[PDB]
């Protein structure tokens, strides 16, 4: 791997998030990487999917259906140029870093809208190649999140609940849906209550970690081969896998907890 | 109850989501509700938080920080008028219906931004009044979600994983965190793959449910009294509560699964 894309979702250049992006860019560059940036607020990026993402006539403007229409525009080269420029940043990149503050327990609206406008069907997924088969299966993505709350509020017994459940919709439903290998999220908690000397260390540990990031082991998701990938089956786990798993104590995943215990830190720690 | 707010996040009046919003409005109006709409697309609602949300002079424009500044603005009456207009709608509402298509395993960006810009500190939550003590604790919220994928994809063995995990960050982290009593979601699956007759039954089903919605039992979240709500303890579950829970087979909820089995449909079905 030699190209990295840094997507940043923060309005302030005075912010620690911005500093985390700057630190990632410096470390990667110093290590031989090409780094490309998507500073969404600085790009004044438009996060609202609409029929203006299609450049030209619509297949059915009286019954406008965004996924069908946008897939068709992608095949025919009729996507709004600001989408196309992002899709090509993705195409080029080996590594993708998402640097954002956690907002209402997910990504800022500006970055959520980035997924909805840029991760177009066919380009970012098809139903014939989902999850570990996805188009991005050669790429690696990592979430670098800062929070207001403290680590303990998001421990199994913290008031907010398991961070691993909060991460699941993003890391499995978005990134890994499209084929990304997801690395362990960089989680920096209670950043607005961290003394100056700690913030400095946080930025050093981030830069240190990027020195070898491409070698890391990604999170575990259940492989798509465990499932009957057709409607007649329901995209349910294969009968013989269900059987094999009745014995087992743990679910496979946050999402595939199977009513049993969730493997510890499934969405936070790769398998040691 | 008397007053309903319906927030819709869909660009097309021809969509089933729009029909769901029309149905909800008629059903509640016929039973004597006042009903107000926030059709985000028709409003062309700005979904990006920024310094522009604070009309007038900032407290520290040299280090803009949105939580403190927006809260100050709220207390001093300097929130941008569109924000303020939606906070008014919310104050008057007893019931809030969120009608949206599921997009990348959460809410459309336009609704994510609506939360971010409208659920301001002090207005929508305090350090001192989180979750079941929250400012909206007299109000009831419900999610009305449509999906492309089908129900079995989101069952415990569906390839997508437990829908209960997907709902957690929204229903607990956003609605309940502000004090809402969260009612069972209205989950209409594979709506693009549903014949017209079923479609009409879903609309009628939804209207029939809305005839007694206020009398429904809300979803279960761990009460905040089970937690030491202070930084000294880290907002960890109280000692006596952990002990007493060590002998229980199920966790309390999706977020507080405490490494055990998650109680079935904790986020989809109220407790019997
Ligand atoms: C709408 C909204 C929703 C939110 N929802 C949640 C939620 O669900 N959960 C949650 O936990 N939090 C939530 N938050 C809080 C949010 O996660 C934090 O405010 C955010 O993570 C802080 O990031 P920041 O970089 O802006 O911090 P900043 O305050 O911008 O930066 C932190 C400190 O680092 C300093 N700094 C800046 N640059 C550098 C540098 N180069 N080197 C060293 N120090 C530097 C700054 O001066 C500052 O003192 C929410 C906030 C908003 C606005
Ligand atoms: C960016 C994006 C991301 C997405 N992510 C996901 C995801 O993560 N998971 C997922 O499951 N899905 C996802 N989807 C799919 C999405 O959930 C569905 O495509 C959407 O719910 C379709 O609903 P609709 O309101 O647009 O109905 P339409 O697709 O517009 O139409 C549905 C049917 O309802 C009929 N109808 C309309 N009005 C009425 C009426 N009044 N009475 C009777 N019939 C009527 C229409 O004739 C049509 O046959 C995504 C879609 C997009 C664009
Ligand atoms: C600190 C801090 O910074 N941002 C947030 C936040 C803002 C919006 C949504 C979610 C989190 C936050 C915080 O979590 N305060 C409270 N949560 C647990 C506490 N309690 O139990 O009382 S105090
Ligand atoms: C149908 C349908 O409609 N919208 C979506 C969707 C679009 C973006 C993100 C998530 C869902 C969708 C769908 O999920 N098809 C796949 N589900 C499991 C399948 N598999 O395992 O192969 S095929």
Residue numbers in the entry:
A (entry chain A), B (entry chain D): 2 to 273
Question: What did the original publication write about this model?
Answer:
Though previous studies demonstrate the importance of NQO1 signaling for the progressive phenotype in colorectal cancer and GSTP1 is overexpressed in many cancers and linked to drug resistance, the molecular mechanisms of how these reductive enzymes involved in GBM proliferation remain unclear. Both NQO1 and GSTP1 are well-known phase II metabolism enzymes catalyzing diverse reactions that collectively result in broad protection against electrophiles and oxidants. Using a strategy based on high-throughput chemical screening (HTS) and affinity chromatography, we identified a small molecule NQO1 and GSTP1 dual inhibitor, MNPC, that suppressed the proliferation and stimulated apoptosis in a highly passaged cell line and primary GBM cells bearing the EGFRvIII mutation. The co-crystal structure between MNPC and NQO1, and the molecular docking of MNPC with GSTP1 revealed that MNPC blocked the active sites in both enzymes.
Tyr126, Tyr128, M131, Phe236 from one protein monomer and Trp105, Phe106, Met154, Tyr155 from another monomer formed strong hydrophobic interactions with MNPC. Interestingly, the hydrogen bonding between His161 with the amide carbonyl group of MNPC and the hydrophobic interaction between M131 with the thiazole ring of MNPC locked MNPC in a spatial orientation in which the plane of thiazole ring was perpendicular to the plane of the benzene ring and FAD. Since NQO1 and GSTP1 were the major binding proteins of MNPC, we conducted in vitro reductase enzyme activity assays with purified recombinant proteins and found that MNPC inhibited NQO1 and GSTP1 activities with IC50 values of 0.926 and 0.797 μM, respectively. According to the crystal structure, the existence of Pro186 stabilizes the β-sheet. For R138W mutation, its position lies in the loop connecting two β-sheets. The mutations caused by these two gene polymorphisms are not in the active center and might not directly affect the inhibition of MNPC.
